[PDB]
Amino acid sequence: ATYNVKLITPDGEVEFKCDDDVYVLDQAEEEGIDIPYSCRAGSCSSCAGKVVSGSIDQSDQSFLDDEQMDAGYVLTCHAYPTSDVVIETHKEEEIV
Ligand code: FES
């Protein structure tokens, strides 16, 4: 129910409110968050962030491996915040 998502951006963080039923992008741009997006389809080799804490559901994309997920990564186009989550954005060239 509308959680406090942190995006640790290079800029130096953008904490924002993200609905459990919205993507961590769609509602980010609303606050003004320029995430490193390229598309919204979910068959890419870019567009990721590092899950620091909390849990979220990205069972929608088709890119990040089990390794990357477990290792602490998430796609940044198709992700639903299930609680207060902390993630770092700009992690294309940290997962590949
Ligand atoms: S840029 Fe294509 S799903 Fe993220």
Side-chain angles (χ1 to χ4, degrees):
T2 305
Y3 305 114
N4 186 97
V5 180
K6 184 182 305 211
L7 300 170
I8 296 151
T9 53
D11 285 76
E13 295 163 79
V14 300
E15 257 171 286
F16 87 101
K17 250 59 91 301
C18 201
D19 320 60
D20 24 304
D21 285 321
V22 86
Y23 297 129
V24 200
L25 158 65
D26 248 293
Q27 197 72 274
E29 292 182 83
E30 296 277 68
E31 313 238 40
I33 300 175
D34 187 9
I35 245 157
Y37 145 104
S38 305
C39 111
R40 191 246 270 179
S43 191
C44 282
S45 305
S46 185
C47 65
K50 208 157 198 160
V51 180
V52 176
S53 191
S55 318
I56 61 177
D57 176 15
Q58 50 164 346
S59 74
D60 191 14
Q61 95 307 15
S62 202
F63 169 28
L64 276 78
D65 309 87
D66 290 289
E67 332 199 325
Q68 296 168 339
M69 295 188 218
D70 185 72
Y73 295 107
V74 63
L75 205 100
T76 194
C77 290
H78 310 77
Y80 290 102
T82 50
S83 302
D84 51 305
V85 49
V86 183
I87 165 271
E88 313 173 52
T89 67
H90 305 48
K91 308 291 172 140
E92 147 248 48
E93 267 185 25
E94 286 199 30
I95 64 173
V96 302

